[PDB]
């Protein structure tokens, strides 16, 4: 797609700290951009929609190539349309925003310039942020994560994409998502099937795969840390059910691991660690700091800070594994005890290290789940299982929770706030901000 300018595009600024082994941190100035899927897509020459509700214009978009030629992405009114605001080092995303139309959530990328994404090399480094999850009930996910996207959003590879990172193009993740409207500078109208339960979305014939580091998928009830390897590290198109992932009839046929090696303290047995109020180690009614360390071995370490008190990731015992580090032994024990082979089939932490050794783009999002109602994060899943099935229970939310239309109606003012991002060598991010 190209870019149009019937609505101006001004990325909300966001600062963050880059820290050094020598003990100082210095402020960096970036901004955030909303993903292309949230945007108005219209004809280059008029205000006629190329995509409307959950279907495409059959005349503007008779095939993927003609559609991309005929159509552009336009600018975003971040606060009034999307409920996205920033102030200094803080970003807030509202759940439901009512303007001329209803908008649900947002997916945002950190920019290095008006036209390029910021790339972070995670290996050997740590990433710290503060989060307020107090306004996130069952069924919602405020997510902070990394994906192996191109810095230009795909422009250099696919010259029919001239919109680029400035318009939030080029997304990929470990689900090989097929709900994207443009992939590789072409539309995704071929094979499009409108969602049966979502007025605004559908599933197309192609998907967009890449490595995904889920630092944070969470609400006030549950939180998870999950690496997802793929056999191709960076962004790559896939076709139909060969994509695998959430959007395909077959979840596992493809190049990415859509399950990951997840660490959810509640799932692992510590049901007292994270939740609302003072009965929990970390009280989710209050802001908390989350620090994630990517050691050169490929293992991942985690600690939290709240009210100046530090907590390592809680210890877990699973099969022969005992510890608090997300390493080969954990991931192997997890597959053995909870089931599955997707993570190992895709090369596990060894393959994942290829992603963290390269650049990844920072994503911050707020979403509800039209496929599984977020039950995999905060409930019992699948819902017929009980607590006697190892790993079935992931949080205390009812298996009836998270119906999108219900949570959108009952909790439209839900929100997440991410702030005080700091990044640098392991051991450096707790030093004074600059």
Ligand X SMILES: O[C@@H]1[C@@H](O)[C@H](O[C@@H]2CO[C@@H](O[C@@H]3CO[C@@H](O[C@@H]4CO[C@@H](O)[C@H](O)[C@H]4O)[C@H](O)[C@H]3O)[C@H](O)[C@H]2O)OC[C@H]1O
Ligand Y SMILES: *[C@@H]1O[C@H](CO)[C@@H](O)[C@H](O)[C@H]1NC(C)=O
Ligand Z SMILES: O=C[C@H](O)[C@@H](O)[C@@H](CO)O[C@@H]1OC[C@@H](O)[C@H](O)[C@H]1O
Q: Which residues bind ligand Z (CB under 6 A)?
A: 107, 141, 143, 145, 173-175, 212, 214, 217, 226, 228, 365, 367
Residue 283 is a binding residue for a second copy (CB under 8 A): no
Per CB under 6 A, the list member of 311, 345, 371, 412 interacting with ligand Y is 311
Residue from 303, 338, 385, 403 binding a second copy (CB under 8 A): 303
Nearby residues of 17 by Cβ (< 8 Å), 6 or more positions away = 25, 26, 27, 28, 89, 420, 421, 422, 423, 424, 429, 433, 434
> Rounded to the nearest whole angstrom, what is the least distance from the CB of residue 350 to a second copy in the complex?
13
Q: Which among 200, 213, 255 has a CA at the least distance from the CA of 230? A: 255
Q: Applying CB under 8 A, which of residues 59, 322, 350, 400 lies at the interface with a second copy?
A: 322
Sign (positive/negative) of CA torsion 259, 95, 74, 146?
Answer: negative
Question: Considering only CA atoms, which of 22, 1, 117 is closest in space to residue 69?
Answer: 1
Site membership for a second copy, residue 269 (CB under 8 A): no
Our finding on whether 361 is near Co ion (CB under 5 A) is no
Nearer to a second copy, 88 or 427 (CB): 427
* Position among 49, 201, 281, 306 found at the interface with ligand Y (CB under 6 A): 281
Nearer to ligand X, 251 or 286 (CB): 251
Distance from CA of residue 251 to its chain's centroid?
Answer: 18
The window from 129-137, 240-248, 293-301, 302-310 that contacts Co ion (CB under 5 A) reads 293-301
Residue 353: name its binding partner from ligand Z, Co ion, ligand X, none (Cβ under 5 to 8 Å by kind): none
Give the nearest distance from C-beta 69 to ligand Z in angstroms.
27
Give the total of residues touching a second copy (CB under 8 A).
30
191/323 with CB nearer ligand X: 191
CA distance 251 to 245: 5
Among 92, 103, 380, 429, binds ligand X (CB under 6 A): 103
Report the alpha-carbon distance of residue 115 to residue 112 in Å, rounded: 8
| 113: number of Cβ within 10 Å | 13
Residue 354 CB neighbour total at 10 angstroms: 18
**Which one of ligand Y, ligand X, a second copy, none interacts with residue 124, CB within 5 to 8 A by kind?**
a second copy
- Site for ligand Y contains 270 (CB under 6 A): yes
Q: Output the smallest distance, CB 355 to a second copy, in A.
A: 17
CA distances from 322 to 114, 315, 330, 331 (A): 46, 7, 8, 12
Closest among 102, 107, 104 to 94, alpha carbons compared:
104
- Applying CB under 6 A, among 37, 135, 174, 351 the residue interacting with ligand X is 37
Q: Which stretch binds ligand X (CB under 6 A): 97-105, 273-281, 313-321, 400-408?
A: 97-105
Tokens coding 86: 């920033």
Task: From the list Co ion, ligand Y, ligand Z, none, pick the one residue 174 interacts with, judged by a Cβ distance below 5 to 8 Å according to partner type.
Answer: ligand Z
Element (H, E) at 140: strand 140-147
Is the peptide bond prior to 285 cis by the omega test (within 30 degrees of 0)?
A: no
User: Is the CB of 47 or the CB of 310 nearer to ligand Y?
Assistant: 310
The first and second tokens of residue 276, run together, are 């609302």
Which candidate, 71, 7, 8, 75, places its Cα nearest to that of 45?
71
For a second copy, the binding residue among 310, 320, 409, 410 (CB under 8 A) is 310
Residue 212 within binding range of ligand X, rule CB under 6 A: no
391-429 burial: b if 16+ Cβ within 10 Å, else e:
bbbbbbbeeebbbbeebbeebbebbbbbbbbbbbeeebb
- What residue ranges bind Co ion (CB under 5 A)? 299
- What residue ranges bind a second copy (CB under 8 A)? 21-23, 124, 281, 295-297, 299, 303, 309-315, 322-325, 327, 329, 425-428, 430-432
């Amino acid at each position: 797609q190209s870019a149009c300018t019937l609505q101006s595009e001004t990325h909300p600024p966001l600062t963050w700290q880059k820290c050094s082994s020598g003990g100082t941190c210095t402020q960096q100035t970036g901004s955030v951009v909303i993903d292309a899927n949230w945007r108005w897509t219209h004809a280059t020459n008029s205000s006629t929609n190329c995509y409307d509700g959950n279907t495409w214009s059959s005349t503007l978009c008779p095939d993927n190539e003609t559609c991309a030629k005929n159509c552009c992405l336009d600018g975003a009114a971040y606060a009034s349309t999307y409920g996205v605001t920033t102030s200094g080092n803080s970003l807030s995303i509202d759940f439901v925003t009512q303007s001329a139309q209803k908008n649900v959530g947002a997916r945002l990328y950190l920019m290095a310039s008006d036209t390029t994404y910021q790339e972070f090399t995670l290996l050997g480094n740590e990433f710290s942020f503060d989060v307020d999850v107090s306004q996130l009930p069952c069924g919602l996910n405020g997510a902070l994560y990394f994906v192996s996207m191109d810095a230009d959003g795909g422009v250099s590879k696919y010259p029919t994409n001239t919109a680029g990172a400035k318009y939030g193009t080029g997304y990929c993740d470990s689900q090989c998502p097929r709900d994207l409207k443009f992939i590789n500078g072409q539309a995704n109208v071929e094979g499009w099937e409108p969602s049966s339960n979502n007025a605004n979305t559908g599933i197309g014939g192609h998907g967009s795969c890449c490595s995904e580091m889920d630092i944070w998928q969470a609400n006030s009830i549950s939180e998870a840390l999950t690496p997802h390897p793929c056999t191709t590290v960076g962004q790559e198109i896939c076709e139909g059910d060969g994509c695998g992932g959430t959007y395909s009839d077959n979840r596992y046929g493809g190049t990415c691991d859509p399950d990951g090696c997840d660490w959810n303290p509640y799932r692992l047995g510590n049901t007292s660690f994270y939740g609302p109020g003072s009965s929990f180690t970390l009280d989710t009614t209050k802001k908390l700091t989350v620090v994630t360390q990517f050691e050169t071995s490929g293992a991942i370490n985690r600690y939290y800070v709240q009210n100046g008190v530090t907590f390592q990731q809680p210890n877990a015992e699973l099969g022969s594994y005992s510890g608090n580090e997300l390493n080969d032994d954990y991931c192997t024990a997890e597959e053995a005890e909870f089931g599955g082979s997707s993570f190992s089939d895709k090369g596990g932490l060894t393959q994942f290290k290829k992603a963290t050794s390269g650049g990844m783009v920072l994503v911050m999002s707020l979403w509800d789940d039209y496929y599984a109602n977020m039950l995999w994060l905060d409930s019992t899943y699948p819902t017929n299982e009980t607590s006697s099935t190892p790993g079935a229970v992931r949080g205390s939310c009812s298996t009836s929770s998270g119906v999108p239309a219900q949570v959108e109606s009952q909790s439209p003012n839900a929100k997440v706030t991410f702030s005080n991002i700091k990044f640098g060598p392991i051991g450096s991010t707790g030093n004074p901000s600059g």
